[PDB]
Amino acid sequence: XLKAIAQEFKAIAKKFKAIAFEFKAIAQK
Amino acid sequence: XLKAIAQEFKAIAKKFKAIAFEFKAIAQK
Amino acid sequence: XLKAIAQEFKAIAKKFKAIAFEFKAIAQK
Amino acid sequence: XLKAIAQEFKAIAKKFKAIAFEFKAIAQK
Amino acid sequence: XLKAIAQEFKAIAKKFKAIAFEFKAIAQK
Amino acid sequence: XLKAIAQEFKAIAKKFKAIAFEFKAIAQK
Amino acid sequence: XLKAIAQEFKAIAKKFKAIAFEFKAIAQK
Amino acid sequence: XLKAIAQEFKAIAKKFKAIAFEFKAIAQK
Amino acid sequence: XLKAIAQEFKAIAKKFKAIAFEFKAIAQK
Amino acid sequence: XLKAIAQEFKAIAKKFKAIAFEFKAIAQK
Amino acid sequence: XLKAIAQEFKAIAKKFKAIAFEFKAIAQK
Amino acid sequence: XLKAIAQEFKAIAKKFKAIAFEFKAIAQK
Amino acid sequence: XLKAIAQEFKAIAKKFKAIAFEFKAIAQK
Amino acid sequence: XLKAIAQEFKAIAKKFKAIAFEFKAIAQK
Amino acid sequence: XLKAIAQEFKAIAKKFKAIAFEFKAIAQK
Amino acid sequence: XLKAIAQEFKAIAKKFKAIAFEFKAIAQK
Amino acid sequence: XLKAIAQEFKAIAKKFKAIAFEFKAIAQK
Amino acid sequence: XLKAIAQEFKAIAKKFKAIAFEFKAIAQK
Amino acid sequence: XLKAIAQEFKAIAKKFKAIAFEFKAIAQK
Amino acid sequence: XLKAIAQEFKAIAKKFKAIAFEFKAIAQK
Amino acid sequence: XLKAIAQEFKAIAKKFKAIAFEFKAIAQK
Amino acid sequence: XLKAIAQEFKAIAKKFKAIAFEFKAIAQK
Amino acid sequence: XLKAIAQEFKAIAKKFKAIAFEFKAIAQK
C-alpha cells in the first residue's frame, strides 16, 4: 504494499501539478 | 480555455495528492 | 476509508470529462 | 490532432467512473 | 475485485502512453 | 513546451502501469 | 480542514526522524 | 550527547506522528 | 552535514508558518 | 482561543527560522 | 554559538507548555 | 482527542527542555 | 565584457556574505 | 543591533549573487 | 533583464539606508 | 566615529538608487 | 549612459575605501 | 575583527573600481 | 649589522604609523 | 585632504614594516 | 631577496610624490 | 610655507628612486 | 598636534642618520 501505491500517487500528483503549471505558460504565450 | 485547463489540472493534482494521503493513512491501518 | 476514495474518484472522472469538453472547444476554434 | 485528445480523455473519464464504482462495492463487502 | 482495477489501470496507462505519443507528433506539427 | 508535456504523460503512463502491476500483486496476497 | 493539519504533522514527524538519523552520523563521526 | 539527542529527536518524531494520526481520526468526527 | 540540518529546519519553519496561517482560518469559521 | 494558538505557531516558526539560520552560520565556521 | 540554540529550545519548550495549556481549556469548553 | 493532544504536548515540551539542557552541556565541554 | 562583470559581482557577493558571517560573531560576543 | 546588520549583509550578499547570476545569463545572450 | 537589475538595486539602496539608520542608533547608544 | 559610517552609508544608498534609475533608462532605450 | 554608471561605481568604490580606512582606525582605538 | 572587515571593504572597493573600469570600456564599444 | 638596520626600520615604521594616526585627529578637528 | 594623506602615511608605515621584516629574514641568512 | 627591497622602494618613492602632490593643494586652498 | 613641505618630499621621492635603482644593481652583481 | 609631528620628524631624521652610519660601516667590511 500500500505504501508504494500511496507514494506513487503523491509523485503523479506532483507531475500533474507541474503539467498544470506548464499549460499556464503556453496560455500566456 | 487555456486558464481553465491549467486550473483544472491543478485541481486533479490536489485530488490525487489527497488520494495518496488517504492511502498512506490506511496503509498503516 | 474506502468510501472517501470512491467518492473522490467520482470527482476525478467528473473533472476529466470537463477536460474532454474544453479540448473539444479548442479542437474547433 | 486535437480530436484524438478530446475523444480520448472522454474514455479516460468513463474508465475512472468504473474504478469508482468498483471501489463502492469494495467498500461494502 | 481487485483484478478489474489492475486491468483498468493498465488500460489507462496504455491510453496515456498513446496521449504522450500524440503530443510528440503535435509538437512538431 | 510541448516536449515537456509528452515526457510528463509518458512518465505518468509508466507510473500507472506500475500501479497496475502493484495491484496485481496485492490482489493475490 | 483537518486533513491538512494531520498532513503537516505527519510530514514534520518524518523530517524530525530524518534529523535524528542525520545527527547519528555526526555522533559516529 | 549526541546519541541521546538522536533518540530524543526520534521520540519527538514518533509523538508528532501519533498526533498526526489523532487529528486524522478526529477529522471525520 | 550541517547544511542539511539548516535546510531541514528552514522547511520546518515554513511548514509551521503556513499552519499558523491555517489556524487563523480555522479560528474564524 | 484559537487566535492565541495561531500567534504561538507564528512565533515558533520564527524561532525555527532563526535556528535554521544559525546552523548555516555554524556550518561554515 | 552554541549557547543561543540551547537558550532557544528552552523558549520553544515553554511555548509548547502554553499551547498544551490552551488545548486543556479547549478540551473542556 | 483533545485530552491526548494536550497531554502529548506536555511530553513534547518536556523533551525540548532536555534537548536545551543537553545542548547547554555540550556548549561548555 | 560581460563575463568579467558577472564574475566580479559574484566575488563581491561572496565577500559580503563573509562580512555578514563575521559581524554575527561580534554580535554574540 | 548587531544581529540586524549581519542578517542585512547576508540578504544583500544574496541579492548580489542573484545579480551576478543575471549578468551570467545575459552574457551568453 | 534589465528590469530585474534596476529593481534589485532599489532593494540594495533600501537596505543600505537601514544600515545607516542602524549605525546611527549605535552612535547614540 | 560611528557617525561618519552612518552618514557615508546614506550617501552610498543614495548613489545606488541613481544607478538603479539609470538602468531603468537603459532598459527602455 | 553608460559613463554615468562607471562614474558612480568609481565614486562608490572611493567611499568604500574611505569606510575601510575608518574601520582600521576604529579597530585600534 | 574589525581588521578583517576593513580588509574586506578594501577588497570590495578594488573590485568596484575594476567593474567601473570595465564599464568604461564597454561604454565606448 | 643588518640587525640594527632592520630594528631601526621597524622603529621608524611604528613612528610613521603614529604620524598617520596623528594626522587623522587633525583631519576632523 | 587629510584622510587621504593619513592613509597614505599608514601605507608607508606598512611598507617600512615589510622592509624591516625582510631585512630581519635576510640578516640571519 | 634584494629584488623585493628595490621594488618596494619604488613604491615608497611613488607614494611620496603623491604626498607632495596632495600637499600642493593644501598649499593653495 | 607650504611649498617647502611638498618640494622637500619631492626631492625625497627622487632620492628614494636612486636608492631603489642602486639596490637593483646590488641584486644583479 | 603639530608639535608632536615636529619631534617625530626629527626622530626619523636621527634614525636615518644612524642608518647611514651603519651602512657606512657595512660598506667597509
HEC-encoded secondary structure of S2-15: CHHHHHHHHHHHHH
- Which of V16, K24, S23 is closest to L6 using CA atoms? K24
Which amino acid belongs to residue M6?
A
Please answer yes or no on whether G4 and I22 come within 8 Å at the CB atom. yes
Which CA distances in Å does Q4 have to J9, P6, P25, R14, R21? 49, 25, 12, 18, 12
What is the total residue count of chain E?
29
What is the C-alpha separation between M18 and M14, in angstroms, rounded? 6
End-to-end CA distance of chain W: 43
Other beta carbons within 10 Å of I17:
17
Task: Return the H-helix or E-strand segment holding B20.
Answer: helix B3-28
CA within 13 Å, CB half, H7:
3
Spell out the residues 6+ positions from residue I8 whose beta carbon is closer than 8 angstroms to its own. G15, G18, G19, G22, J20
Interface test with D, best of E19, E23, E29 (most D CBs within 10 A): E19
What is the C-alpha separation between N6 and M16, in angstroms, rounded? 10
- Which of H20, A3, F19, C9 is closest to D27 using CA atoms? C9
What is the C-alpha separation between P14 and B24, in angstroms, rounded? 56
Interface test with T, best of U3, U10, U17, U22 (most T CBs within 10 A): U22
Q: How far is CA P22 from the centre of its chain?
A: 11
- Which of J25, B25, K9 is closest to H8 using CA atoms? K9
Which among B9, B13, B23 has CB closest to A6? Answer: B23
CA dihedral R13, P16, O14, P8 (to 10 degrees): 50
Given a contact cutoff of 8 angstroms between Cβ atoms, the answer to whether G5 and I9 are in contact is no
Burial of Q17 (0-12, 13-18, 19+ CB in 10 A): buried
Given a contact cutoff of 8 angstroms between Cβ atoms, the answer to whether M12 and N17 are in contact is no
Q: How far is CA R2 from the centre of its chain?
A: 20
Spell out the residues 6+ positions from residue E11 whose beta carbon is closer than 8 angstroms to its own. D15
What is the total residue count of chain I?
29
Which amino acid belongs to residue V10?
K
User: How far does the CA of residue V25 sit from the closest CA of chain U (Å)?
Assistant: 9
Q: Is the dihedral of CA V13, V17, V22, V28 positive or negative?
A: positive
Please answer yes or no on whether G5 and H23 come within 8 Å at the CB atom. yes
Buried (b) or exposed (e) across T4-28, using 16+ Cβ within 10 A?
bbbbbbbbbbebbbbbbebbbeeee
Which among P3, P16, P21 has CB closest to O16? Answer: P16
- Which of L22, S12, O13 is closest to T12 using CA atoms? S12
Given a contact cutoff of 8 angstroms between Cβ atoms, the answer to whether R4 and M21 are in contact is no
Q: Is the dihedral of CA C20, A20, A16, B20 positive or negative?
A: negative
Other beta carbons within 10 Å of M13:
20
User: What phi and psi values does residue S26 have, to the nearest 5 degrees?
Assistant: -70, -30
Kindly list the partner chains of chain U, i.e. chains with 3 or more CB atom pairs below 8 Å.
T, V
User: How far does the CA of residue G3 sit from the closest CA of chain B (Å)?
Assistant: 9
Spell out the residues 6+ positions from residue A21 whose beta carbon is closer than 8 angstroms to its own. B6, B10
Please answer yes or no on whether M24 and J25 come within 8 Å at the CB atom. yes
Other beta carbons within 10 Å of J5:
19
Given a contact cutoff of 8 angstroms between Cβ atoms, the answer to whether L6 and K24 are in contact is yes
What is the C-alpha separation between O6 and C22, in angstroms, rounded? 41
Please answer yes or no on whether D22 and E5 come within 8 Å at the CB atom. yes
Q: How far is CA B25 from the centre of its chain?
A: 15
What is the C-alpha separation between C20 and T1, in angstroms, rounded? 79
- Which of P29, M17, N19 is closest to O9 using CA atoms? N19
Given a contact cutoff of 8 angstroms between Cβ atoms, the answer to whether F18 and E29 are in contact is no
Q: Is the dihedral of CA R12, R15, R19, R21 positive or negative?
A: positive
Radius of gyration of the CA atoms of chain G, in A: 13
Spell out the residues 6+ positions from residue T18 whose beta carbon is closer than 8 angstroms to its own. U8
Would you list the DSSP string of D6-21? HHHHHHHHHHHHHHHH
Please report where in the chains the cell 496521449 appears, as a residue: E19
Cell of U20: 607632495
Please report where in the chains the cell 566615529 appears, as a residue: P1
User: How far does the CA of residue Q3 sit from the closest CA of chain S (Å)?
Assistant: 32
Spell out the residues 6+ positions from residue F19 whose beta carbon is closer than 8 angstroms to its own. A5, A8, A9, E9, E13
Chain M hits for N13, Cβ within 8 Å: 13-14, 16-17, 19-20
Q: How far is CA K23 from the centre of its chain?
A: 12
What is the C-alpha separation between O26 and P3, in angstroms, rounded? 9
Task: Return the H-helix or E-strand segment holding K7.
Answer: helix K3-28
Nearest-Cα residue of chain H relative to residue B21: H24
User: What phi and psi values does residue F24 have, to the nearest 5 degrees?
Assistant: -60, -40
This structure's resolution (angstroms)?
A: 3.9
Chain T hits for U5, Cβ within 8 Å: 19, 22-23
Technique employed here was cryo-EM
Which among A4, A12, A22 has CB closest to F12? Answer: A12
Residues of O with CB under 8 A from a CB of P: 2-3, 5-7, 9-10, 12-17, 19-24, 26-27
Q: How far is CA R14 from the centre of its chain?
A: 3
Which amino acid belongs to residue M29?
K
Please answer yes or no on whether N9 and M23 come within 8 Å at the CB atom. yes
User: What phi and psi values does residue O10 have, to the nearest 5 degrees?
Assistant: -60, -45
What is the C-alpha separation between R16 and Q6, in angstroms, rounded? 9
Kindly list the partner chains of chain K, i.e. chains with 3 or more CB atom pairs below 8 Å.
J, L
For chains A and B, CB pairs below 8 A equal: 68
End-to-end CA distance of chain K: 43
Which among U2, U12, U23 has CB closest to T12? Answer: U12
Given a contact cutoff of 8 angstroms between Cβ atoms, the answer to whether T4 and Q22 are in contact is no
Cell of S23: 594626522
Residues of J with CB under 8 A from a CB of K: 4-5, 8-9, 11-12, 15, 18-19, 22, 26
Buried (b) or exposed (e) across K10-23, using 16+ Cβ within 10 A?
bebbebbbebbebb
Please answer yes or no on whether U23 and V14 come within 8 Å at the CB atom. no
Which among Q5, Q9, Q22 has CB closest to P5? Answer: Q22
Cell of K13: 519548550
In a 3-state reduction of DSSP, which class is residue F29?
coil
What is the C-alpha separation between S12 and T13, in angstroms, rounded? 8
Burial of B25 (0-12, 13-18, 19+ CB in 10 A): buried
What is the total residue count of chain S?
29
User: How far does the CA of residue E12 sit from the closest CA of chain D (Å)?
Assistant: 7
Please answer yes or no on whether S12 and W15 come within 8 Å at the CB atom. yes
Spell out the residues 6+ positions from residue K22 whose beta carbon is closer than 8 angstroms to its own. J4, J5, J8
Buried (b) or exposed (e) across P14-28, using 16+ Cβ within 10 A?
ebbbebbebbbeeee
Q: How far is CA W3 from the centre of its chain?
A: 18
What is the C-alpha separation between H15 and D8, in angstroms, rounded? 47
What is the C-alpha separation between I14 and I8, in angstroms, rounded? 10
What is the C-alpha separation between F14 and W14, in angstroms, rounded? 90
Cell of U26: 593644501
What is the C-alpha separation between R2 and Q20, in angstroms, rounded? 10
Please answer yes or no on whether G16 and H13 come within 8 Å at the CB atom. yes
Widest distance between CA atoms in chain C:
43
Given a contact cutoff of 8 angstroms between Cβ atoms, the answer to whether J21 and I11 are in contact is no
Spell out the residues 6+ positions from residue B25 whose beta carbon is closer than 8 angstroms to its own. G6, H21, H24
What is the C-alpha separation between R23 and S13, in angstroms, rounded? 38
Spell out the residues 6+ positions from residue S17 whose beta carbon is closer than 8 angstroms to its own. T9, T10, T13
User: What phi and psi values does residue U2 have, to the nearest 5 degrees?
Assistant: -55, -35
What is the C-alpha separation between E23 and D4, in angstroms, rounded? 10
CA within 13 Å, CB half, H13:
18
Spell out the residues 6+ positions from residue V5 whose beta carbon is closer than 8 angstroms to its own. U20, U23
User: How far does the CA of residue J29 sit from the closest CA of chain I (Å)?
Assistant: 11
What is the C-alpha separation between G17 and H12, in angstroms, rounded? 8
Looking at residue J16, the DSSP 8-state letter turns out to be H
In a 3-state reduction of DSSP, which class is residue U2?
coil
Given a contact cutoff of 8 angstroms between Cβ atoms, the answer to whether K9 and L16 are in contact is yes
CA within 13 Å, CB half, T20:
17
Nearest-Cα residue of chain C relative to residue B29: C1
Nearest-Cα residue of chain I relative to residue J15: I13
Q: How far is CA L8 from the centre of its chain?
A: 11
Chain A hits for F12, Cβ within 8 Å: 12, 15-16
What is the C-alpha separation between S23 and S14, in angstroms, rounded? 14
Cell of M7: 564574475
Other beta carbons within 10 Å of L3:
10
Spell out the residues 6+ positions from residue J18 whose beta carbon is closer than 8 angstroms to its own. K8
Would you list the DSSP string of H16-29? HHHHHHHHHHHHH-
Q: How far is CA U2 from the centre of its chain?
A: 20
What is the C-alpha separation between I5 and H2, in angstroms, rounded? 14
Chain Q hits for S24, Cβ within 8 Å: 25
In a 3-state reduction of DSSP, which class is residue E2?
coil
Cell of R29: 564599444
Given a contact cutoff of 8 angstroms between Cβ atoms, the answer to whether Q8 and P15 are in contact is yes
Q: Is the dihedral of CA G25, G28, H1, H5 positive or negative?
A: positive
Please answer yes or no on whether B19 and A9 come within 8 Å at the CB atom. yes
Chain H hits for L8, Cβ within 8 Å: 15, 18-19, 22
What is the C-alpha separation between E26 and E18, in angstroms, rounded? 12
Please report where in the chains the cell 476525478 appears, as a residue: C12
What is the total residue count of chain W?
29
What is the C-alpha separation between K6 and K24, in angstroms, rounded? 27
Which CA distances in Å does B18 have to C8, C18, D15, D23? 9, 20, 20, 16
